[PDB]
């Protein structure tokens, strides 16, 4: 009792119907307190989609519907588009605690997103960061759909063990992934070696960028 339980994730084909459940109890919605459905994109405040279990505010598409039965509510999305990928929460009042409760969230995903090769950009250090001993190679990786990506660094021919920091891949607005790898080096290390390479591997494909300390 006194909890709103959601599936952690739901999946569906593009253009088809999908449903997200919200399981309450006798204190919150068996009570009949309304279920409210919020939609949130990465890096944005939660947007209100459904209120009073089926009512849509102005500016919400009719492809999002709500239903309520007993202790369970459901948010239905028809004609799934790639733009529907977001986090969906259900909220309700609870008289036992006398508090507004939210669900832990449901991550919606469409299954028809094709593979995308990553684009790689390698920035060498500048004299500014060189003389300040903040010299770092920057390897920016973007626009690849399969989140899995592996990054390696090479010193002329040889793997660099230390100084490498690689971020986890993150979804951008276009539902593709971005990541970055920073290789920290001292001015002696940068001026000593002939070249440095960032190698990015994705689904058995490799993209290697190389830079030189020329002058």
């Amino acid at each position: 009792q006194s909890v709103l339980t959601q599936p952690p994730s739901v999946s569906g084909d593009p253009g088809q119907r999908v449903t997200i459940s919200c399981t309450g109890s006798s204190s919150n919605i068996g009570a009949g307190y309304y279920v409210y459905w919020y939609q949130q994109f990465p890096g944005t405040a939660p947007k209100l989609l459904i209120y009073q279990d089926n009512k849509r505010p102005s500016g919400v598409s009719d492809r999002f519907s709500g239903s309520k039965s007993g202790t369970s509510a459901s948010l239905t999305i028809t004609g799934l588009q790639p733009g529907d990928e977001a986090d969906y929460y259900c909220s309700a009042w609870d008289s036992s605690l006398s508090a507004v409760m939210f669900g832990r969230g449901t991550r919606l995903t469409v299954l028809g997103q094709p593979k995308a090769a990553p684009s790689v950009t390698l920035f060498p250090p500048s004299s500014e960061e060189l003389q300040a001993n903040k010299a770092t190679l920057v390897c920016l990786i973007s626009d690849f759909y399969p989140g899995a990506v592996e990054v390696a660094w090479k010193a002329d021919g040889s793997a660099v063990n230390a100084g490498v920091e690689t971020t986890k891949p993150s979804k951008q607005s276009n539902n593709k992934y971005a990541a970055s790898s920073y290789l920290s080096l001292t001015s002696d290390q940068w001026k000593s070696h002939k070249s440095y390479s960032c190698q990015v591997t994705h689904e058995g494909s490799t993209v290697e960028k190389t830079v030189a300390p020329a002058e």
Partner: protein
């Protein structure tokens, strides 16, 4: 046309008091209930409480009742939250929201949300280095200018270009967590290659927790 603007520190030491203020423009505090919601990075929203815009009535989350306090200043048309005895479990993005005066609990207007980090480490302003235009990676006669933001302890850093005038082609990557606990990110922007010498480009970096504001011009290092 309601505009909620959030102010408050980004870093709070453990056992200290977090204080946030939501200022309302285009409307008065009266006529609505005003709530504070928080969302830990990676988790869902959590209701902290709300305060009546007309009367003195306040309601809190029972799990937070002994530590949170909501107040309002009608003369300045704002309200505020304070959380005492703060710990790492209070690190989250904090939003202020509006709710109709009636006894229904839907939130239709939200603030931007300020990130609050509870750590024992000190705040460190960012070091901003330009990244000279590189055209090997970009396609169809365009280059990529960059700005690297190195070694800043709290997370939120905002980056814009040409004082917000340049928006297309801007990509700000997620930050990296250095082994020293500091953060670093990069903001890149794709610009027409034939416009490098005639157009000036400045990246604006704002790190509000350290109150640092830098504006680095990205001039052409090589050709």
């Amino acid at each position: 046309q309601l505009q909620l603007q959030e102010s408050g520190p980004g870093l709070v030491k453990p056992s200290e008091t977090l204080s946030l203020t939501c200022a309302v423009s285009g409307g008065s505090i009266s006529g609505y209930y005003w709530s504070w919601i928080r969302q830990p990075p990676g988790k869902g929203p959590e209701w902290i409480g709300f305060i009546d815009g007309n009367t003195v009535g306040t309601n809190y989350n029972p799990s937070l009742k002994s530590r949170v306090t909501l107040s309002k200043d009608t003369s300045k048309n704002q309200f505020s939250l304070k959380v005492s005895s703060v710990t790492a479990a209070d690190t989250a993005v904090y939003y202020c929201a509006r709710k109709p005066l009636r006894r229904y609990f839907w939130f239709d207007v939200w603030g931007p949300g300020v990130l609050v980090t509870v750590s024992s480490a000190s705040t460190k302003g960012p070091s901003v280095f330009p990244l000279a235009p590189s055209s090997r990676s970009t396609s169809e006669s365009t280059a990529a200018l960059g700005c690297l933001v190195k070694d800043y302890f709290p997370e939120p850093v905002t980056v814009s270009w040409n004082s917000g005038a340049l928006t297309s082609g801007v990509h700000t990557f997620p930050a990296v967590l250095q082994s020293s606990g500091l953060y670093s990110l990069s903001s890149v922007v794709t610009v027409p290659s034939s416009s490098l010498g005639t157009q000036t480009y400045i990246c604006n970096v704002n790190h509000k927790p350290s109150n640092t504001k830098v504006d680095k011009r990205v001039e052409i290092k090589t050709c």
